[PDB]
């Protein structure tokens, strides 16, 4: 007799013609398990901002002193409850572009671009401290910035140059303080018509304080706008200010990288060594699809919104039916005088095992797809980015679903076609699947017929 294997497995699959089908085997392609656990990637521990954001970490917020020793990392992690950034009220100018640049860097080195004690002899560096930037009981200020006030009633026009001999890009940060009263402006920087000029060889911006009465944020009616720029190797940046200058104390020598990124996550940090890292938790999987989270770091499976992506490897588990008795092979040869296998179908099985490899390799893995941040004046670009992400996600979800459904249909047609072909080869009779023989066919005769070469006219 000729039939097909049927095991006790109950893995279900869906196709276009009918759904929820039951077959003898399956191979899931959607990995829906996350460790829930932040682990280092490629042996490099991440940088956990913790209670701070990128602005607070870079500016040198007094509550981010654990990050002042950070030199290298695989990916920046900021918790959703990260509000220690920009303690003094004001807006970080091009903050989101700064995050975009920071996502590329893999490591930097924090150095005194202008040493505090040496750089400013004619300006007074000890005075500047604010209650808004309070560390412990005492008031404090940013660790990477320096607030220069007039020394002895005079604020002579400072002119400080730095030549980028570090051999790499240098991220210079400063600020321009906008007081709340003209009296404050005169009391801090004696010149009322103050200005700040920061001119590199490719950066040229001039800032002017704008004294106005504002609502109090964090107990302060003044504002401090923070600016940044990247200094190319072997280049000079000149800081010239007559007042309102929060000079750069420390800068960062950026060593650019690739594959890193910024993820906002809640998962706690422990020790592993993975290849993928979503905010929900680090994962690895050879399966080419994961639904855990769109935002990934490193080598990760493609992200689709689906909930079940199952290839079909086995034949229809539930004319001849399933051969529960024989578990030896996908195909059986029942003997009147147990089901056996044939070598001519192992090649087809290997072809299917190659086919699953083909479909998984045709889905090129997704690389670092960290989200972008936009301000309240970039809702158009934010919605364009959202539309792009959602359109690509929908297209790849639809592509994955089409591929699984058409592949399951094609492979089920395969599992029927090969069975029918084997029936023909055995022929070359009861239609249920068995082969009645008028001649006496012993077990040796059955094996010879299984070889496909039998002399039917011999019996006559």
């Amino acid at each position, epitope marked *: 007799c000729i039939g097909y294997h049927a095991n006790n497995s109950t893995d279900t699959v869906d196709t276009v013609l009918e759904k929820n089908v039951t077959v003898t085997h399956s191979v899931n392609l959607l990995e829906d398990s996350h460790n829930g656990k932040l682990c280092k990637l490629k042996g490099i521990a991440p940088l956990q901002l913790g209670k701070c954001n990128i602005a607070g970490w870079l500016l040198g917020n007094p509550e981010c002193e654990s990050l002042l020793s950070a030199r290298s990392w695989s990916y920046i992690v900021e918790t959703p409850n990260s509000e220690n950034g920009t303690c003094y009220p004001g807006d970080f100018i091009d903050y989101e572009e700064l995050r975009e640049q920071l996502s590329s860097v893999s490591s930097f080195e924090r150095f005194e671009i202008f040493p505090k004690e040496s750089s400013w002899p004619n300006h007074n560096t*000890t*005075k500047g*401290v*604010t*209650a808004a930037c*309070s560390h*412990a*009981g*005492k*008031s404090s200020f940013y660790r990477n910035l320096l607030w220069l006030t007039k020394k002895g009633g005079s604020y002579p026009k400072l002119s400080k140059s730095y030549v980028n001999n570090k051999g790499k890009e240098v991220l210079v940060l400063w600020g321009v303080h906008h*007081p*709340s*009263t003209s009296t*404050d402006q005169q*009391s*801090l920087y004696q010149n009322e018509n103050a200005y700040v000029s920061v001119v590199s060889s490719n950066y040229n911006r001039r800032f002017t304080p704008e004294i106005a009465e504002r609502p109090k944020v964090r*107990g*302060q*009616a*003044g504002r401090m706008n923070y600016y940044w720029t990247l200094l190319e190797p072997g280049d000079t940046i000149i800081f010239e200010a007559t007042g309102n200058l929060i000079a750069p104390w420390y800068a960062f020598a950026l060593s650019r990288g690739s594959g890193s990124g910024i993820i906002t996550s809640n998962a706690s940090m422990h020790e592993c060594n993975t290849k993928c890292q979503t905010p929900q938790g680090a994962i690895n999987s050879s399966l080419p699809f994961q639904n855990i989270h769109p935002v990934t770091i490193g080598e990760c499976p493609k992200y689709v919104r689906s909930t079940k992506l199952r290839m079909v490897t086995g034949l229809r588990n539930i004319i001849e039916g399933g051969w529960t008795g024989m578990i030896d092979g996908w195909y059986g040869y029942h003997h009147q005088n147990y089901a056996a296998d044939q070598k001519s179908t192992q090649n087809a099985i290997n072809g299917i095992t190659n086919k699953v490899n083909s479909v998984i390799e045709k889905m090129n893995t997704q690389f670092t797809a960290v989200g972008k941040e936009f301000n309240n004046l970039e809702k158009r670009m934010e919605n364009l980015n959202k539309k792009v992400d959602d359109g690509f996600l929908d297209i790849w979800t639809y592509n994955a679903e089409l591929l699984v459904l058409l592949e399951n249909e094609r492979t089920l047609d395969f599992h029927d076609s090969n069975v029918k072909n084997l029936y023909e080869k055995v022929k070359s009779e009861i239609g249920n699947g068995c082969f009645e023989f008028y001649h006496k066919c012993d077990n040796e005769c059955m094996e010879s017929v299984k070889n496909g070469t039998y002399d039917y006219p011999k019996y006559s």
Partner: antibody
Amino acid sequence: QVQLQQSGAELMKPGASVKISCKATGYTFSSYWIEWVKQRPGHGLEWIGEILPGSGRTNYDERFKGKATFTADTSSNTAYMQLSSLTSEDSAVYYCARPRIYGMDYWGQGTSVTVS
Amino acid sequence: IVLTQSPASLAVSLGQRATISCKASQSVDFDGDTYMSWYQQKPGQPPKLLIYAASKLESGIPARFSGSGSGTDFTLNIHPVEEEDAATYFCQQSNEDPWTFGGGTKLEI
């Protein structure tokens, strides 16, 4: 519920050394500074210095340089102030206080040192 | 910094407004914030913070304790006084690092 325990009363002859003990309760010991302030009758309250527990960074008033040395034990939540070579001119009552931006809100009971 | 105070001793009857003037050698308001504190000290007890920022009232301190002033002129006004208000009063500046205190004033009944 924050409390700052202090040691009892101590007395030593001039030229001795004393390790004044301050014990902080109810909050992260290293998080806030521990200020040291000296009070003498007829002279008011004078700031001796400060020590940030755990960090090790400390500041001293200029007039107390060398006279006062601060150490911290973050394991026991205890802050210690040391006076070396006590003189009759340095007899007072010493407080350990938790600073806030504008002033010290939480204080200790205080310890008085004599020179006889 | 140097931070003077006046009067050295204050004699105010019960139910009478008591004003204590603290003056500073240097201005103690930086960036529109006044770093000034007001303390009261029972004898043999640590000082208690009453007015911080020279105008803000401390939590747990009644509305009678009120102060004001900015720059180098600061006043603490007590009204109406009570038998418990008899204490030595301290003004402290936090703008300068020495965090110098005031002389202290005795208020009687």
